[PDB]
Design a protein around this ligand. Structure first.
Ligand SMILES: Cc1cc(C(=N)N)sc1-c1ccccc1
Ligand SMILES: Cc1cc(C(=N)N)sc1-c1ccccc1
Ligand SMILES: Cc1cc(C(=N)N)sc1-c1ccccc1
Ligand SMILES: Cc1cc(C(=N)N)sc1-c1ccccc1
Lengths: 230, 10, 230, 10
């Protein structure tokens, strides 16, 4: 499967090398190969998967935004539209690839809260990225798929994880972005970010120095957004 | 413009 | 030829769009497509070609250096070597692609000094990049191919261009890097950079404000290297 | 470590 002949351990090692070399397309292909071996992923390996694809899709989203801006300017030749469509299509394929890995079969095999919440968050994230470029007939159903993934992950995280858990915090952060940027629900976005921040603050006293640093890092992002949004 | 989560979460 | 069905003008327009979106692999494919239309390139178009490939090969050289460093550390499993070899091979193919475009048929059709020197400089540059990763039996012949390309470009530039011409200056700069980094001739590198800088300085009085800015920008790079090298 | 030419030259 491009990577079907390489050992799982070698794929993981090369993913780590590509990260060091900032070769994120390679890193993604390696981690896709690792996932397709069929074994569950460790916490470190789930983070490698997320890092790889987030960087790949991140460059595509930035390109798409530059081009969409030019295209909107141009209607204030078909080339700008054609090339925005090319980038858009490549973004959608990356998102479809990640969603396919989650659906076949990472989520259904994830029984622990840390793995299951991580993967459901990712599912929400990649539907959100699809939503960012979607325009109609599917735009509503894509939004509803992101919302549903995020909501299931929130319910699990509230039952199973402490309020300072970095996965729980990154989840709540991204759901609040979803509310503000995608769902036209800025009040929900602000409420969630506030409630999330305040409940984590009240749980910080239970953490070690290194866990405190992990949690407060994400809390600051919630605060940065609240400053932007209010 | 809104900040989202880092990819890597402990 | 991937791009054979697209209009030359549309390829150039999309190259400019990809530059804005920092999509340099796309930009390179577009400009490769434009070159393969068979028409000579304007000054603007030669610069688009150079920008696209220099950014693509630039990311590969940076990755290769990270990986080669790890590999050398590792000998102070085959994965590090295997993955450095993969990146190296992709770099060599990019360099071979550019060299093929110059040889088929940009250089032979370039009659003006500004075009012919630009293309011969590029030929030297891409053999220099091949030299950076070469190791033996071919390493000497690759070095000699870079030297030869640079030397022909220098001879033309000295006959046909003023000492402040930015192409002449960028040529002399890169040849001096070649001498220092590739050819183990630091004294030649330093001499060339000094002579190049001093002869440009004595010609600056002939330039307009905007040409003065163009020339002094490259002269500063010569000075930065002299500071590094002495 | 040595600086080389920008890609674009006027
Ligand atoms: C937090 C993190 C980031 C990683 C990366 N970007 N390579 S790997 C990782 C991790 C997670 C759990 C246990 C050990 C390491
Ligand atoms: C962090 C935080 C907690 C808040 C609360 N529920 N009391 S309001 C808030 C905030 C609001 C606007 C700008 C920056 C921070
Ligand atoms: C200097 C330069 C840089 C360019 C770029 N990076 N797109 S296009 C260009 C040029 C050259 C000659 C005449 C008009 C424009
Ligand atoms: C620019 C320049 C010109 C020189 C000359 N031929 N006189 S020496 C020089 C230089 C040397 C060392 C460090 C920085 C600059």
């Amino acid at each position: 499967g491009a990577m079907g002949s390489m050992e799982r351990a070698s794929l993981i090692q090369k993913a780590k090398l590509a990260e060091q070399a900032e070769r994120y397309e390679d890193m993604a292909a390696f981690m896709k190969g690792a996932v397709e071996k069929g074994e569950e992923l460790s916490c470190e390996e789930r983070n490698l998967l997320s890092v790889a694809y987030k960087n790949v899709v991140g460059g595509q989203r930035a390109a798409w935004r530059v081009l969409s801006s030019i295209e909107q300017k141009s209607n204030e030749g078909p080339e700008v539209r054609e090339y925005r469509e090319k980038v858009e299509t490549e973004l959608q394929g990356v998102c479809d690839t990640v969603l396919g890995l989650l659906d076949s079969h990472l989520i259904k095999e994830a029984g622990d809260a840390e793995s299951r919440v991580f993967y459901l968050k990712m599912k929400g994230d990649y539907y959100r990225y699809l939503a960012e470029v979607a325009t109609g007939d599917d735009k509503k159903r894509i939004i509803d798929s992101a919302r549903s993934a995020y909501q299931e992950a929130m319910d699990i995280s509230k039952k199973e994880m402490p309020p300072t858990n970095p996965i729980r915090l990154g989840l709540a952060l991204n759901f609040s972005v979803f509310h503000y940027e995608i769902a036209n629900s800025p009040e929900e976005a602000i409420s969630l970010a506030k409630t999330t921040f305040d409940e984590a603050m009240a749980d910080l006293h239970t953490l070690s120095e290194d866990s405190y640093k992990d949690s407060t890092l994400i809390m600051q992002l919630l605060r940065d957004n609240l400053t932007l949004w209010t | 413009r809104s900040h989202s989560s880092p990819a890597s979460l402990q």
